[PDB]
Structure formats: structure tokens, C-alpha cells
Amino acid sequence: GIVEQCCASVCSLYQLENYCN
Amino acid sequence: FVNQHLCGSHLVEALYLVCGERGFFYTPK
Ligand SMILES: [Cu+2]
């Protein structure tokens, strides 16, 4: 998932918004 | 904005920045 994606690859701040409440 | 390489505590910093008072879930494998 994103914890993996951001670290192993890259991610955007827009992808991170998906994890907001 | 630009793409991010974020591991460990640096990811949770970015989550905090993006979500703020909305709060967020940090859910690894
Ligand atoms: Cu560091």
C-alpha cells in the first residue's frame, strides 16, 4: 500500500490525502 | 506539488502536514 509505495517508490501529497479522516 | 520519497517517520510527518486537524490513519503492512 502507500506506506510501501512512498518508501519503496514515490508518492504525491495528493495520494496522501486519501489517508485523511 | 512534486513527488515524494518518504520512509519511516518522514511519511507520518507528511501525513500530518497534508491532513492536519482532519486527522489520519497510518496503516502499514
Ligand atoms: Cu531521516
GROMACS .gro file of C-alpha atoms and ligand atoms in nm:
model
   51
    1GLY     CA    1   0.000   0.000   0.000
    2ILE     CA    2   0.101   0.365   0.042
    3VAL     CA    3   0.336   0.319   0.335
    4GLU     CA    4   0.518   0.085   0.099
    5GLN     CA    5   0.469   0.292  -0.220
    6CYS     CA    6   0.601   0.622  -0.073
    7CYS     CA    7   0.909   0.445   0.061
    8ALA     CA    8   0.994   0.180  -0.200
    9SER     CA    9   0.885   0.407  -0.483
   10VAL     CA   10   0.747   0.760  -0.469
   11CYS     CA   11   0.412   0.910  -0.384
   12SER     CA   12   0.245   1.250  -0.411
   13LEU     CA   13   0.085   1.463  -0.143
   14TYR     CA   14  -0.240   1.410  -0.334
   15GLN     CA   15  -0.208   1.035  -0.290
   16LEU     CA   16  -0.161   1.102   0.084
   17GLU     CA   17  -0.493   1.289   0.112
   18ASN     CA   18  -0.659   0.950   0.069
   19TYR     CA   19  -0.546   0.870   0.425
   20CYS     CA   20  -0.705   1.169   0.590
   21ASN     CA   21  -1.009   1.115   0.811
   22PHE     CA   22   0.349   1.988  -0.587
   23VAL     CA   23   0.625   1.734  -0.654
   24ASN     CA   24   0.662   1.356  -0.596
   25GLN     CA   25   0.788   1.237  -0.260
   26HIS     CA   26   1.025   0.971  -0.133
   27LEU     CA   27   0.909   0.912   0.225
   28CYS     CA   28   1.015   0.633   0.458
   29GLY     CA   29   0.955   0.580   0.829
   30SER     CA   30   0.882   0.885   1.044
   31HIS     CA   31   0.911   1.109   0.735
   32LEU     CA   32   0.589   0.960   0.593
   33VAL     CA   33   0.395   1.033   0.912
   34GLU     CA   34   0.528   1.390   0.904
   35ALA     CA   35   0.392   1.429   0.551
   36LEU     CA   36   0.056   1.278   0.656
   37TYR     CA   37   0.035   1.522   0.944
   38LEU     CA   38   0.109   1.813   0.707
   39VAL     CA   39  -0.145   1.702   0.448
   40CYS     CA   40  -0.427   1.604   0.686
   41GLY     CA   41  -0.382   1.836   0.984
   42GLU     CA   42  -0.687   1.866   1.210
   43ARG     CA   43  -0.873   1.623   0.987
   44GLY     CA   44  -0.652   1.355   1.135
   45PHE     CA   45  -0.527   1.049   0.954
   46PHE     CA   46  -0.471   0.673   0.972
   47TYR     CA   47  -0.117   0.533   0.944
   48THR     CA   48  -0.168   0.178   0.821
   49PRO     CA   49   0.145  -0.016   0.711
   50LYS     CA   50   0.174  -0.386   0.635
   51CU      CU   51   1.552   1.057   0.821
   0.00000   0.00000   0.00000
